[PDB]
Design a protein around this ligand. Structure first.
Ligand code: MN
Ligand code: MN
Ligand code: MN
Ligand code: MN
Lengths: 334, 334, 333, 329
């Protein structure tokens, strides 16, 4: 199959006025969190990965009510990640393999991804994703209010350059090691201007002079040990001030910080709430892996149940958000 | 100024019949080493970085003599790296900054890199390089007999896919932590077939189905602790066997193993040499950083003196190669 | 920003049934060009397409005649998107799809492919004029017979294009009355060429064409009209002397009709008589027809040309029954 | 695999001096088209270029006459790579039927650049929608063939070119097609083209205000005073420049090279009597006269027969002398 260029997809699914309005302001609102001008708490919450658009839309419908209810405390954004990167061997995600049958139908996957994101934004839910790849971003980055670079790629030069060219805030994860320095450096690198090689909306390789991305930050996501608590937060903030970059950071309640057990996500959030109640001046956000139904499954049999990492279910998601708004209500009052 | 596609470079500088046979043959020869079919020692030696083609060619002429001289003991290949990754400080290498003046001139830079490579293979010197991104390899991979993926991108899914479609053998580095698993996972992923995005010789994005690369292997390059000795090699080999991948590996004499001191490359070589005399079954090659003149300089004033990592000079290079040839002749005769 | 053909092919893939109609009809026409079959090819429909709704209603009506007369005539609809005008005027549905002087080529190519896919799906093959080297890729797969413009029959690059098409192509005699250029053009179109063109992915490239063996001539007047037996017999002699097929198409409209739509029927009558007598050299005719007769400067009335004047449906029924009847007798000898 | 223009522009960028010469020659020919200068444009040289060595040798000689006659004639070399029919130098640069277009475009661009750099401006016929951008930048004057003057896509092409362009009457002898072609190419167009990078694209051309007609025979040869007055009328009637070019070879010579001089004589006399509407002539000329089927003799055509150098000297002197008088009055 010939790969369709971005312009093909952009022509069928142009950004709407409302969607570009929401991306613009959500980007702006998050910038304010990164630089300490607003004290609301970014919450990146949703499925480990998107495998069904229908489930994703219903998830977004519920999430949206809670984003509106808690809007003075939290800034809620949906995880719309298309894949779980592989150490090896599972399913590569919606874009790479949208039919979940090992066919590669990238053209269909990118169309479906663009469509899901346009629809979420159109209903009022801004969206987040991880940019793995140097070529796919162009397809839907205009519908993204916040991007991640993963633990496995935060050290990659071309990923740092990718980030320097995006128009959304970007979070960089510490190494699968626990190494924070690679993420701090990455901030350095992404904030500067670069002469990169990328591919245009028309599908041709090209030189792009990036403008630098001034709204990057660190994500604490565990390593050898969990790095979510106050002491790890304090040490990180120190390192961040020493490199002269922002000391506002995000914490991932999931992955290595929950030690690969979804039931511990709540416990990590409880620890974060307590830091917000005492002080927690260095935290601008959190990350949660959440779905309609808890746990995981190998085959997409059950509706709204993850097929990559296990997630908490809707019930626990309600509790968890209520917990963080409350604790953040108090921090914003001091 | 606009970016030229690989076909423009291939039309000025087509691969000669001699270079392509030299490449086909050297790749096959290295595959024999990776899979334990031959017991010669692969030796990847040469400047930390190429900043001058003239000095580079003169280096190769001398190195060519030793390659012939030790051809029954050592398989010698020139290091032809166009940069040292640098986290935000200094010269971006010869492809990005070919004029060494801080400008960016990638059309000139890719042209000059291909020229050099074409001239090295025509004189009878095979070449090795590090593939950093997904776009530039297409400009000269046909001239490369062995490649490396940088420690910084070892975990990167997109670099693993890159390696899976390269036709040369590829070596992957243990992590900046001393960590071997990530290199072994990389061999895993790079040996499989992948559906990925890349850019054709014509400069267009496209879907590629890679065939998988069977000749990948590990490179031991230190972590917090140097990892060139018997014990580390023994331990490395076990992990490799337990993962069902080749237990033949390469050891970096430079950088962390040298404790970042160019005067210690010889020490590490000695240790490797004693392993070869004794047993050394699991060693298939070594990396060495070497130039016409020893040391380093901040600015490119002195002819044939590195402006990136410090290198051993030509004299010490002859002594080291002689030491390795002699040790390996002994291994080969048992 | 111009979208490559692959973008339109992804949204509007050719269906199996369209695929089979195109294939079948190109072969069927091929047999007319080379005299293996004696049915009369009729290219018929509006001068230009300005409204897909009317074109669809027209195709529906035509399809029924296509079947009624299926043993005497091979009816293929005319789906031209413009009349080339040597003065100011509407640039046609591909360039100006919105009919407001806008240029919106993406929308226009998409709409053209869609109409053409809809027509093949309903069971009506389609013909068109290929006017340039770039747009045909977007829908050539949906076309059973093509024409090269009278203005481009001498153009080497348009001859190279015909050599690459997989449908039969017709070449017109020169506004002069000139037949040599069409004969030369068949000459050239039948050979392999190494030309430059644009790929499905939107890139310039070298293509090696295989030759198009199913080309033929179209008689479209002077100067003086050239549809009668005397002109026909003369064309055939030259075609033979050139060693190319001596089966030809005659255009009932335009200059052969003295630029008057009410005279298309008279040209058809004369062709009917020739078919009744002998007319062994005629393999097809061309007719400008719409739902309603005539023309109008603005698109005010439904199914009425805004380019050249066409006969209406009433006259269309009459003209076709005449050629079926007359060709029935040809085929029975 | 077709290289894009940018690959050839990267190897062979226009020099400071070539840029100057092109801009100046377009501007000077423009002056002839619009009646600010009364020199005679002479488009002269080989029928087709099949050897760059010969072409550079010919240019070297033509240069000397371009200087000698710079106050009377504006001499521009004819650098046409083919004759519509051997498929020409760009298609078949090796003259062996192997179609190495990449080599042929490169060699085409190289020769053009050398010619400009030696002080010799250059003209060619744009046949094709895709090739022009590989070297339009080195051309001071373009032609559209009689066989494409009616083509809409070739009119649009000329609409986007920065050099004056001449349009031929048809193989008819039909002038109206070249007249409607000026109208069309003078307007702005939304046409499809190919970028310097090799991708198809929408380009909005700005219009070409320096176009004009080329009289090149019928029918009956159409070079004389009467035929000229007839064309002028129609051109004025059509509201376009009544200043035109006359081809001395091809139809107007009855396909006879020896007769080229004859046409030039008629033209000279008009230039002396009055000849106000003539701004240019075209002549087919090589180092050696005649023609050949195989390229065995150096400097001799293998498409249309040309005059040799000796006759070129005479034909040029005759046109300069005649035009000096016109410019005197
Ligand atoms: Mn996950
Ligand atoms: Mn180094
Ligand atoms: Mn018409
Ligand atoms: Mn000629």
């Amino acid at each position: 199959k010939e790969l369709l260029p971005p312009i093909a997809h952009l022509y069928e699914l142009p950004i709407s006025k409302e969607a570009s309005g929401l991306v613009h302001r959500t980007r702006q609102e998050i910038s304010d969190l990164v630089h300490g001008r607003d004290k609301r708490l970014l919450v990146i919450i949703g499925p480990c990965s998107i495998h069904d658009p229908k489930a994703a839309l219903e998830y977004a419908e519920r999430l949206l009510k809670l984003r509106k209810q808690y809007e003075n405390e939290l800034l809620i954004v949906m995880r719309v990640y298309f894949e779980k990167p592989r150490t090896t061997v599972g399913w590569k995600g919606l874009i790479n393999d949208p039919h979940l049958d090992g066919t590669f139908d990238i053209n269909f996957g990118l169309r479906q991804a663009r469509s899901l994101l346009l629809s979420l934004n159109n209903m009022g839910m801004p969206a987040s994703t991880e940019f793995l790849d140097m070529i796919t971003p162009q397809y839907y980055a205009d519908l993204i209010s916040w991007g991640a670079i993963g633990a496995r790629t935060t050290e990659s030069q071309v990923h740092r350059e990718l980030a320097s060219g995006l128009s959304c805030p970007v979070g960089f994860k510490n190494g699968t090691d626990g190494n924070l320095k690679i993420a701090i450096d990455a901030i350095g690198a992404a904030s500067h201007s670069h002469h990169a090689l990328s591919v245009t909306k028309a599908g041709h390789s090209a030189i792009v002079h990036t403008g630098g991305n001034p709204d990057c930050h660190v994500i604490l996501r565990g390593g050898k040990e969990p790095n979510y608590d106050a002491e790890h937060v304090s040490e990180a903030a120190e390192q961040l001030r020493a490199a002269g970059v922002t000391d506002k950071l995000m914490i991932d309640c999931s992955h290595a910080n929950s030690r690969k057990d979804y039931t511990r996500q709540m416990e990590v959030a409880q620890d974060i709430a307590a830091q917000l109640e005492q002080d927690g001046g260095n935290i601008m956000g959190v990350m949660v892996e959440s779905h309609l139904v808890e746990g995981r499954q190998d085959k997409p049999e059950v509706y709204g149940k993850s097929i990559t990492d296990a997630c908490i279910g809707w019930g626990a998601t309600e509790e968890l958000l209520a917990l963080l708004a409350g604790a953040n209500k108090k921090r914003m009052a001091r």
